[PDB]
Design a protein around this ligand. Structure first.
Ligand SMILES: *[C@@H]1O[C@H](CO)[C@@H](O[C@@H]2O[C@H](CO)[C@@H](O[C@@H]3O[C@H](CO)[C@@H](O[C@H]4O[C@H](CO)[C@@H](O)[C@H](O)[C@@H]4O)[C@H](O)[C@@H]3O)[C@H](O)[C@H]2NC(C)=O)[C@H](O)[C@H]1NC(C)=O
Ligand SMILES: *[C@H]1O[C@H](CO)[C@@H](O[C@H]2O[C@H](CO)[C@@H](O[C@H]3O[C@H](CO)[C@@H](O[C@@H]4O[C@H](CO)[C@@H](O)[C@H](O)[C@@H]4O)[C@H](O)[C@@H]3O)[C@H](O)[C@H]2NC(C)=O)[C@H](O)[C@H]1NC(C)=O
Ligand SMILES: *[C@@H]1O[C@H](CO)[C@@H](O[C@@H]2O[C@H](CO)[C@@H](O[C@@H]3O[C@H](CO)[C@@H](O)[C@H](O)[C@@H]3O)[C@H](O)[C@H]2NC(C)=O)[C@H](O)[C@H]1NC(C)=O
Ligand SMILES: *[C@H]1O[C@H](CO)[C@@H](O[C@@H]2O[C@H](CO)[C@@H](O[C@@H]3O[C@H](CO)[C@@H](O)[C@H](O)[C@@H]3O)[C@H](O)[C@H]2NC(C)=O)[C@H](O)[C@H]1NC(C)=O
Ligand SMILES: *[C@H]1O[C@H](CO)[C@@H](O[C@@H]2O[C@H](CO)[C@@H](O[C@@H]3O[C@H](CO)[C@@H](O)[C@H](O)[C@@H]3O)[C@H](O)[C@H]2NC(C)=O)[C@H](O)[C@H]1NC(C)=O
Ligand SMILES: *[C@H]1O[C@H](CO)[C@@H](O[C@@H]2O[C@H](CO)[C@@H](O[C@@H]3O[C@H](CO)[C@@H](O)[C@H](O)[C@@H]3O)[C@H](O)[C@H]2NC(C)=O)[C@H](O)[C@H]1NC(C)=O
Ligand SMILES: *[C@H]1O[C@H](CO)[C@@H](O[C@@H]2O[C@H](CO)[C@@H](O[C@@H]3O[C@H](CO)[C@@H](O)[C@H](O)[C@@H]3O)[C@H](O)[C@H]2NC(C)=O)[C@H](O)[C@H]1NC(C)=O
Ligand SMILES: *[C@H]1O[C@H](CO)[C@@H](O[C@H]2O[C@H](CO)[C@@H](O[C@H]3O[C@H](CO)[C@@H](O)[C@H](O)[C@@H]3O)[C@H](O)[C@H]2NC(C)=O)[C@H](O)[C@H]1NC(C)=O
Ligand SMILES: *[C@@H]1O[C@H](CO)[C@@H](O[C@@H]2O[C@H](CO)[C@@H](O)[C@H](O)[C@H]2NC(C)=O)[C@H](O)[C@H]1NC(C)=O
Ligand SMILES: *[C@H]1O[C@H](CO)[C@@H](O[C@@H]2O[C@H](CO)[C@@H](O)[C@H](O)[C@H]2NC(C)=O)[C@H](O)[C@H]1NC(C)=O
Ligand SMILES: *[C@H]1O[C@H](CO)[C@@H](O[C@@H]2O[C@H](CO)[C@@H](O)[C@H](O)[C@H]2NC(C)=O)[C@H](O)[C@H]1NC(C)=O
Ligand SMILES: *[C@H]1O[C@H](CO)[C@@H](O[C@@H]2O[C@H](CO)[C@@H](O)[C@H](O)[C@H]2NC(C)=O)[C@H](O)[C@H]1NC(C)=O
Lengths: 723, 723
């Protein structure tokens, strides 16, 4: 009847969602970040959305990033930013006054127009720091000249203020590794030493006539990890730099610092996780002593999970709210909020959780000390959803679900409260087209809409959007969610081809009510096929027990859980056994290539064709922090790294078409994996096909490229599908 | 009716030809190298084939190579752990006495069980040398301890006695670069300096956890070439090392030494070719003076060809027989034998050729000074054949064709004469199953058979061998030969798919009556398809004019010549326009990917699918010696390297399937080419498919691998063929 979703549509200015990136500045107003060019400043109390910056950003060579100072008198702009790893704000930095006019290059002292690794504003006034060649420079006053506060930096070897590869990609999940005290007087920063970490060479084939390798420190499983230390310096006066000394538990001689936050302007909280990732230690250090005191500690049989977890302290640095796994009677433990006094005394804990049940809390948003309110997101509704809740810090702990069925057509949520909990920004993300709204904490009434994305709502309604469907299945005391997407003009007579899209990274979640549109949408819409996603054991958001089911068995269970979801889908009559395919990327590529068998024996050849994008195929060749977490430390050969090798599985492979896609200069999952895999396919005399992306990184931060990628992928399955 | 030729057959112990590798030791007997294990020693005069070595070679960890000493009292052996046998004479060597028993490791002085880069026997006695870490060691007596005669060697940078990459692959065509004087008193050796040659890094993805690149000197077009010098040392007494000084012709400031041979035990012949390869200088040097004297010189407009050409001298070092291009009236010049006195005096040449015509002489085999006989191979019969001839060095120069229709069922030939021309070994090579015979020079009578390969003759007769067919076509004053292979059970009703197999390396020859069986045979036999080969301009064995037609036009003409051969084949009715495919490897892969167009416009899409194995795609990235030879020197940008880029052609590509096969650690044609090519396929939004061979070299010296290769190739075409 009307237009099917096509790839062009995917990259259409029509289907582009616009995130206002709203951010509170006070307890009465939020930034009202770019509406579609200009940057405003809404004032919820008395609708006064002033103008802070305008389409003069386009002027500054389309500054990719920008940040208004605290005193709201300047703005920090970055342009010609080039991406490094996951997230890497690293380009040219310019400063300008709030209304408009007169930009200025932010360069270190004595150096000309040079790229910076990071800029960003301080907490108070217009203080700011910027990192150049791994050294931290500071400027209190905008006119003041920069001062090199820390100078032990050494490009690619000694990082301070920013993460090294492993810290950004695996252990800290951010490139930023420094933290200002609340009063902007002291600055805490991690100092990472990759000096003794092995160096991986990345192959190049396109640069000059004689391409050369790009080296960088990357620790494979078992090798030496980056050595880290936490430091703090004064931002006024001689600045005495002090290192925050770590605990002692002999079960913490090799560790990662996974979390650091200021409890007050004198004390800073730190979580110390040991390399084996089975022992954790929360700590309060004196930013003037360097003495850290144990404030709690956890240990697990498998591996500690969710360790970047930031605690919420009471303005007086007194008691605080953390969140961890608590037994929850039977059926593993779940993540819930917990309370402890500021000065936990050696004997026992102040232990006592605020929430409980067989559901996980996923994010503490705020603590209203003036009474008993603690806002957060949870899976209490359905693990596939995200609702905003609130509980009483006192007596009862009654949970009131603020979102739940408010602003309908969407059940996935994110939100932030004003600097007084009064109001809060609330964003959808699904199931319906995403949007941003504003409410007053108490009332819960939509004070107004910030972004509705009508463009998108229109365009979507002009297309045969796929039809969603959730069908919890189950193995053992576990129920595995699994959403199935149907062609939208789905009947029951016709038989459709099955496309299993598997991720399966332990801890992640593939079945959720978020709003997404990718090449999968195109496959369902434009080429009419049903896609199936399922979250087996190892999945997150369903308690420790489920999660840890894959310990030292990476890729074994998930093969069964996935095959079981395929089988139950094969039983239906609106799907024909002959056209079954599988796809997966990253850890998903591993599972993807792991799942190309034949169930039973007489009933062989379950899949027709499969594909893996940047597949990991040997955890011996993968990042320490990841492999060791699920298979335990290597060295003395934990011999879990042997049976998990996907090589053992390709031995089968009889008639399936195998398409491997892999960007050549992949810094996360080295092309080395794909290379080793193909070697096996060759010895095993199997048939494969490779598509390469010469000198390309792991992420695909190019609409142009991402597009080509998708097209390639759809062109593969769509082929081994039509008959 | 009976078995079709299959891949298994190809690698069957049944279809394996056995080359006795017969080699004369005197004027009455040849080695009778391995009959199928044991090594004998036939005595043609009185049938006495003694036994020199036996299946005791299998003993010595299956020595891959072996060589009996001159005094026939010892035997050199060589094996390779991690078996791979190009024949870079590198591995572990052992010495043993002629009958049998007691092997001994040949290691340098003071070093233990270590690999050697080369061994080999001297001319007289049992003298021998061996190269270790690019230094030459000498042992006169078997018991004598080695002496490091030359010690300026530096692994991978300073080679002496052996070629560096470029010298082995392109300019000398051998890894061996040393030559003993006839009397074993003086030793000449090339000293190659790659010190200032750029170093190419080869990507590795499989070795250790952290793969690393493998570096080595490789000169791309325009870069600095290896610097060479010729040296001579005495093998008895203090050994004064002397360098043979090169000429002066300012048109020889940058040169390659392409040929060196001893004229006597005091004089050595050297051919000096300049980098541009358009000026050549034959020279006689005094192995005791170092003074080289011009003895002749050639220059061409295009490029000199066949420069490794060794001259044949009269026992008294007097007059000699060379072979070069001589005008031959009209229609270019052809290669024929030439005579000159030993001491050519400055004025004019002793010039006067012995043979002439529109055919090429391809190899001087011997000179019988006792009269007037000069034996050689030629294309005088048909360029697609090789017959043994003879001519009179005196008065007439009458050519008598010794082979021609002798031992029928085969017209391709190779041969060698005893150390007195009396008898001669004669080997087939085609068209019928290969074999080795023995005749007495005068008589021409088959004294007996040395190797008949009945196994093969049997097995072949049990199979539906493809049917051969030659069909000279023509463009301009040139007739382009083109053999076509038919399915053997070929009718005329049925329509067959066309498989154009193109090589096209300038100077080479693809259409010849040699006996070959590869995946092409399987394609014709087992999958019934007709393959077509054609030799357009640039081909060899048909005079200078034809050859040089491609100068600075690499890939242009050959596209037309090839397309024309395809068209004339398309006209037939036993072939259907719908299933036309093309394949090529190396320079053939270049042409292969160059030929994926549509003739005319309305009659587009000439090919359905094509494939290129290790395709060169940019002569700027190829070996200097090769590119510069056909496109002229680079540097000041000869801008022929731009239009020849295959990139310009892939722009078309609309519906064809493109399968690129490339071994990753290819040292001859860098994977870099395939990488650059794919980048273009991506920008041009074309469809391709890559098959890689992780860490594999360029050659495929593994039956196991070679097999997988073939299978892969047949599996591709056979697919886009069946309907
Ligand atoms: C890698 O790919 C190879 C081909 O690209 C695969 O080889 C085929 O493997 C099958 C099964 O092992 C072989 O048996 C087949 O049996 C079928 C009937 O039983 C035949 O199919 C019929 O229809 C096809 C449709 O195209 C026709 O082409 C065919 O002529 C026939 O009439 C098959 O042809 C064949 O008998 C088959 O021989 C193989 N095919 C070919 C041409 O290689 C291989 O399995 C894959 N994996 C590996 C190498 O292990
Ligand atoms: C500051 O906060 C304001 C809070 O009101 C905000 O205004 C928002 O609220 C009003 C009303 O609550 C929204 O009203 C709009 O939408 C409704 C329903 O679509 C319309 O109602 C009816 O429309 C019919 C037409 O069929 C008309 O005939 C009826 O008389 C009736 O009005 C309204 O007409 C109106 O369009 C308003 O949309 C909403 N604002 C947004 C866009 O979110 C203020 O916007 C805000 N101050 C600023 C700076 O705008
Ligand atoms: C790369 O491969 C893709 C598919 O693997 C090629 O796409 C195909 O291109 C044709 C036309 O170029 C599409 O249209 C066809 O039109 C005829 C009408 O004459 C019709 O009979 C066919 O049914 C077909 O619709 C074809 O649909 C399309 N295939 C798909 C579904 O993608 C592409 O041409 C190749 N090279 C490129 C990208 O240029
Ligand atoms: C990672 O970065 C740190 C700095 O954050 C590096 O520190 C340097 O470590 C070397 C040792 O490898 C020190 O040199 C040694 O000094 C001692 C003096 O006691 C001397 O005996 C040795 O011969 C050697 O010279 C160096 O002083 C130190 N840099 C300074 C001055 O702070 C560290 O090496 C890197 N990785 C690690 C943990 O080794
Ligand atoms: C969390 O994982 C760590 C890492 O395995 C566990 O710690 C222990 O690590 C040490 C490594 O020094 C292992 O010690 C071994 O103990 C045996 C005892 O006979 C000794 O003979 C060996 O020489 C070696 O010292 C030990 O295997 C390992 N413990 C475990 C889990 O087996 C830590 O205990 C784990 N925590 C839990 C219970 O989750
Ligand atoms: C949640 O609320 C939205 C509104 O914010 C709902 O929008 C409605 O979406 C349906 C799609 O099923 C629209 O239907 C279409 O109407 C047009 C009328 O021109 C017709 O041409 C199409 O064939 C189709 O029937 C409907 O117009 C729209 N309602 C309006 C007018 O606002 C939405 O359905 C709800 N859930 C979601 C996200 O689907
Ligand atoms: C390739 O190999 C040769 C040897 O066969 C290299 O010879 C070395 O050349 C360097 C110059 O690049 C010499 O060093 C210089 O020596 C002069 C002597 O007066 C001195 O004044 C300079 O300060 C410098 O040290 C070096 O002596 C020589 N090696 C020896 C001792 O034999 C040659 O350099 C390599 N390729 C080329 C042409 O550079
Ligand atoms: C030394 O030289 C001998 C001289 O010929 C070898 O003999 C060979 O030649 C004879 C005849 O010329 C062959 O005759 C037999 O085979 C043919 C083949 O069909 C028959 O038609 C004929 O009736 C004979 O039966 C020998 O077979 C042939 N021998 C070989 C193997 O070549 C003689 O063999 C050789 N000395 C040795 C060591 O055998
Ligand atoms: C190969 O041919 C030679 C001739 O070169 C044969 O030997 C004699 O040749 C002369 C001609 O110069 C004849 O007059 C003799 O009659 C030949 N010998 C005889 C009687 O056969 C020789 O026999 C052949 N091969 C060998 C040397 O065995
Ligand atoms: C957020 O919006 C609601 C409007 O519905 C406000 O609620 C009123 O608050 C006053 C207290 O200042 C009460 O006395 C009224 O009874 C409330 N109105 C009613 C009847 O709903 C609220 O004031 C707004 N923001 C906040 C938190 O004050
Ligand atoms: C063979 O080629 C060389 C170079 O290509 C010719 O020598 C000259 O080399 C210089 C480089 O310094 C060029 O500038 C000249 O243009 C070259 N001469 C020519 C061909 O114009 C050499 O003469 C060539 N031989 C011939 C005549 O073909
Ligand atoms: C060349 O001669 C051989 C003899 O060595 C011929 O052999 C015959 O080959 C056919 C194959 O078509 C077989 O059917 C016959 O049985 C063979 N003859 C016998 C019985 O020996 C051969 O035909 C000729 N050409 C080639 C190489 O095929």
């Amino acid at each position: 009847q009307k237009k099917k979703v096509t790839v062009e549509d995917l990259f259409s200015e029509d289907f582009k969602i616009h995130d206002p990136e709203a951010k509170w500045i006070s307890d009465t107003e939020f930034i009202y970040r770019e509406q579609k060019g200009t940057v405003r400043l809404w004032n919820v109390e008395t609708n006064t959305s002033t103008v802070l910056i305008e389409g003069k950003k386009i002027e500054s060579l389309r500054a990719i990033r920008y940040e208004i100072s605290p005193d709201r008198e300047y703005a920090l702009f970055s342009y010609n930013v080039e991406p490094i790893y996951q997230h890497s704000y690293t380009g040219y930095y310019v400063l300008s006054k709030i209304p408009h006019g007169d930009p200025q290059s932010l360069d270190p002292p004595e150096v000309s127009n040079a790229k910076l690794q990071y800029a960003g504003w301080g907490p108070k006034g217009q203080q700011l720091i910027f990192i150049f060649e791994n050294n931290i420079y500071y400027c209190a006053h905008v006119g003041k000249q920069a001062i090199r506060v820390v100078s032990t930096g050494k490009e690619g070897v000694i990082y301070n203020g920013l993460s090294d590869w492993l810290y950004e990609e695996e252990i800290l999940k951010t490139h930023i590794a420094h933290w200002w005290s609340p009063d902007g007087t002291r600055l805490a920063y991690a100092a990472i030493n990759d000096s003794r970490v092995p160096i991986m060479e990345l192959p190049t084939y396109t640069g000059s006539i004689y391409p050369t390798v790009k080296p960088y420190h990357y620790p494979k499983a078992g090798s030496e990890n980056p050595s880290i230390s936490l430091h703090v310096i004064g931002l006024n006066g001689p600045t005495h730099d002090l290192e925050m000394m770590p605990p002692d538990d002999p079960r913490m001689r090799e560790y990662y610092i996974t979390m650091v936050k200021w409890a007050t302007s004198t004390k800073v909280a730190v979580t110390w996780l040991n390399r084996a990732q089975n022992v954790s230690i929360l700590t309060l250090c004196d930013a003037t002593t360097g003495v850290c005191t144990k404030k709690h500690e956890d240990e697990s049989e498998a591996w500690l999970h969710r360790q970047n977890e930031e605690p919420v302290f009471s303005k007086d640095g007194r008691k605080f709210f953390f969140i961890r796994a608590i037994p929850q009677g039977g059926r593993g433990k779940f993540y819930h909020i917990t309370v402890s006094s500021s000065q936990p005394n050696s004997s026992n804990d102040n232990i006592q959780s605020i929430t409980s049940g067989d559901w996980d809390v996923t994010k503490i948003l705020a603590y209203d000390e003036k009474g008993n309110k603690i806002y957060f997101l949870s899976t209490e509704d359905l693990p596939r959803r995200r609702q905003l809740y609130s509980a009483n810090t006192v007596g009862n702990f009654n949970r009131q679900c603020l979102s739940c069925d408010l602003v309908e057509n969407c059940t996935y949520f994110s939100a932030s409260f004003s600097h007084s909990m009064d109001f809060f920004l609330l964003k959808c993300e699904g199931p319906g087209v995403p949007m941003v709204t504003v409410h007053n904490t108490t009332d819960k009434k939509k004070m107004f809409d910030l972004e509705t994305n009508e463009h998108v709502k229109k365009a979507i309604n002009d297309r045969q959007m796929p039809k969603v469907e959730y069908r919890d299945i189950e193995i053992d005391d576990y129920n595995l969610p699994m959403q199935i997407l149907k062609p939208a003009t789905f009947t029951d007579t016709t038989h459709y081809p099955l496309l299993l899209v598997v991720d399966g990274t332990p801890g992640s979640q593939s079945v959720a009510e978020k709003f997404e549109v990718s090449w999968e949408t195109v496959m369902v819409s434009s080429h009419g096929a049903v896609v199936v996603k399922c979250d087996g054991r190892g999945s997150g958001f369903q308690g420790t027990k489920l999660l840890h089911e894959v310990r030292r068995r990476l890729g074994l269970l998930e093969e069964k859980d996935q095959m079981e979801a395929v089988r139950t889908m094969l039983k239906e009559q609106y799907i024909d056994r002959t056209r079954v395919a599988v796809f997966g990327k990253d850890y998903g590529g591993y599972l993807s290539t792991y799942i190309l068998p034949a169930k039973g024996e007489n009933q062989g050849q379950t899949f027709t064709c499969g594909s893996a994008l940047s597949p990991i195929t040997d955890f011996k060749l993968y990042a320490s922090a990841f492999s060791e977490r699920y298979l335990g430390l290597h060295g003395l050969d934990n011999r879990a790294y042997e049976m998990t090798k996907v090589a053992h599985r390709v031995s089968a492979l009889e008639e399936q078409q195998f398409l491997i896609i892999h960007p050549t200069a992949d810094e996360k999952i080295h092309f080395q994996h794909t290379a080793e895999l193909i070697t096996q396919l060759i010895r095993g005399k199997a048939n494969y096909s490779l598509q390469i992306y010469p000198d390309e990184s792991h992420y695909f931060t190019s609409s142009s490229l991402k597009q080509h990628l998708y097209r390639s992928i759809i062109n593969f399955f769509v082929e081994c599908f039509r008959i």
